[PDB]
């Protein structure tokens, strides 16, 4: 039987009490779940539905719709790499190559230790600082491989 660890359940419950209606907290809860597990575990969705007083199929549909959520791959750190127009113009491919040199992975893949997954994403709204990537919540301009290596070294 799948139970959220208490410290997660507590945070989930905060979100659910935050808005006037419980069901408005669905995306905040899913973010929180993905933060905790490194992905959305399929088994988590049932208990969340119960707490939101929504049907399971409603919750499943919502996870499926929103691209930030990931049910496939557990990763400690998500390297979100912008593949949209400005970053493409200004050197997305140089960034992908640098990531491949440091980590040994391409977009869509996870390092064997489960530490890093590269996620290709649409415009991150930092186009003046292209090419842009995120490491979990942190966001950076890519300058060069030596610089990127130093940044990634901070994530342990």
């Amino acid at each position: 039987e799948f139970e959220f660890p208490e410290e997660l359940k507590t945070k989930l419950q905060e979100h659910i009490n935050y808005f006037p209606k419980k069901r408005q907290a669905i995306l905040l809860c899913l973010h929180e779940i993905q933060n905790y597990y490194g992905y959305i575990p399929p088994e988590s969705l049932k208990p969340l539905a119960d707490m939101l007083e929504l049907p399971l199929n409603h919750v499943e549909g919502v996870v499926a719709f929103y691209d930030m959520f990931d049910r496939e791959d557990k990763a400690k750190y998500r390297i979100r790499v912008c593949v949209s127009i400005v970053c493409h113009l200004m050197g997305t491919n140089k960034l992908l190559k640098a990531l491949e040199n440091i980590l040994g992975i391409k977009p869509g893949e996870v390092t064997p230790d489960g530490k890093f997954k590269i996620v290709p994403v649409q415009c991150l709204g930092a186009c003046s600082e292209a090419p842009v990537f995120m490491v979990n919540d942190d966001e950076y301009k890519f300058e060069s491989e030596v610089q990127l290596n130093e940044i990634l070294s901070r994530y342990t």
Partner: protein
């Protein structure tokens, strides 16, 4: 507290209004905001009637800064002719390619936005307001939560604000990866805990919105003007820039310019001035080939003398300026725009669903030199046929920029055939 890392986007202003603080790349907390006379506009507003505030916002000529340019005061009037309760929504979904103007307000001067939201909510009689901020702006989310707590501490939010009898709470919701949730009806669906599927309009949100109640949706930048209108008065505000398109405007400039960043300028500024007078010209002093207005329009180098206003011949949109120079392949660029629409159609409408996909799928073939003659003809057809039956603006414009490239850069497309 500690916020996630944010790149330090360059900001510059000739008007010292929206970017007075946000020209410096750091969070400005409530004490610094108060030192600059912050929240005095709210105090003044609470000593006015809602109707007066609406009237001032109307007479200011403020138009929506989220892309469509609808007159803000008029939108509010429509809402308030409908019975309450009413809701106020700040749209902070900003996810269009090239567009990064709203985030610098959120992340550097959150109290400007918050003050704007409080005044606007009071104006339309909303006691509950929302900021819907895209999921990929986590720092902006934490910064706003903290700033709202500051405002509460200082008595600018909660019940009976400053003895006025006006009650307000602002709730911060987060998106989770869908560009379509910036479309105001999909945004509302998301706030209601559902998939971001646009609703048939009309009815407009101001008639039937969140929980079916009158709802005003306004863009971050729109709302950030409201404190200035109240503080200066509508007449002084209308004295900024040209009298038919008055007020400050933020221009996010990216691509092949020397000084990419956000520029606060009057709307009589020309596109050429934005590029060459403010953004420092092009990288390598190469010639401008094209400017993409986000993912909406493509302007050629022959069209640089247009004003950055909401006129028929003007730039329009959100003032998003992506600069391409002479060596940039226009078909490669068009592919990136096609990929965006492919990734972001919600799929409710059939021509949008299949058209966004096929447009990207066939243009990839063209680009890679693997397109048959049928694929070429099919690409052309599909590009012209995304809009039919569409219920929102995405289907209406998914082919627009690409069509303009086909018309304005035929030689380059021809090379690929």
């Amino acid at each position: 507290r500690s916020y996630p890392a944010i790149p330090r986007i360059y900001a510059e202003t000739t008007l010292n209004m929206l970017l007075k603080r946000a020209k410096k790349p750091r969070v400005h907390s409530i004490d610094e905001y108060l030192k600059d006379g912050g929240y005095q506009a709210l105090e003044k507003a609470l000593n006015m009637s809602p109707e007066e505030i609406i009237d001032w916002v109307d007479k200011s000529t403020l138009r929506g800064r989220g892309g469509a340019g609808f007159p803000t005061g008029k939108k509010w009037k429509f809402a308030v002719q409908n019975p309450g309760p009413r809701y106020f929504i700040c749209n902070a979904d900003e996810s269009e390619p090239g567009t990064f103007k709203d985030r610098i307000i959120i992340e550097r001067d959150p109290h400007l936005l918050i003050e704007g939201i409080i005044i606007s909510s009071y104006a339309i009689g909303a006691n509950e307001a929302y900021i819907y901020i895209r999921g990929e702006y986590p720092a902006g989310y934490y910064i706003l939560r903290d700033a709202i707590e500051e405002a509460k501490k200082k008595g600018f939010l909660g019940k009976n604000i400053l003895g006025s009898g006006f009650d307000l709470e602002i709730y911060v919701a987060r998106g989770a990866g869908a560009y379509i949730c910036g479309e105001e009806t999909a945004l509302i669906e998301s706030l209601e805990g559902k998939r971001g599927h646009p609703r048939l309009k009309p009815p407009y949100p101001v008639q039937k919105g969140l929980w079916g109640k009158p709802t005003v949706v306004n863009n971050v930048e729109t709302i950030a003007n409201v404190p200035f209108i109240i503080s200066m008065g509508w007449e002084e505000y209308r004295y900024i820039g040209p009298s038919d398109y008055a007020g400050p405007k933020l221009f996010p400039v990216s691509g092949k310019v020397k000084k990419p960043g956000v520029y606060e300028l009057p709307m009589n500024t020309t596109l050429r001035e934005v590029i060459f007078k403010y953004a420092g010209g092009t990288l390598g002093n190469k010639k401008v080939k094209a400017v993409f207005s986000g993912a909406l329009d493509c302007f050629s180098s022959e069209e640089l003398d247009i004003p950055m206003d909401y006129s028929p011949l003007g730039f329009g949109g959100t003032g998003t300026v992506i600069v391409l120079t002479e060596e940039d392949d226009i078909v490669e660029a068009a592919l990136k725009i096609a990929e965006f629409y492919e990734h972001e159609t919600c799929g409710q409408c059939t021509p949008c669903r299949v058209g966004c996909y096929e447009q990207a799928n066939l243009l990839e073939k063209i680009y890679k030199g693997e397109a048959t003659e049928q694929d070429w003809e099919g690409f052309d057809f599909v590009n012209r046929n995304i809009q039919p039956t569409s219920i929102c603006g995405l289907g209406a414009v998914a082919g627009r920029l690409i069509r303009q490239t086909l018309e304005k850069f035929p030689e380059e497309w021809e090379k690929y055939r």
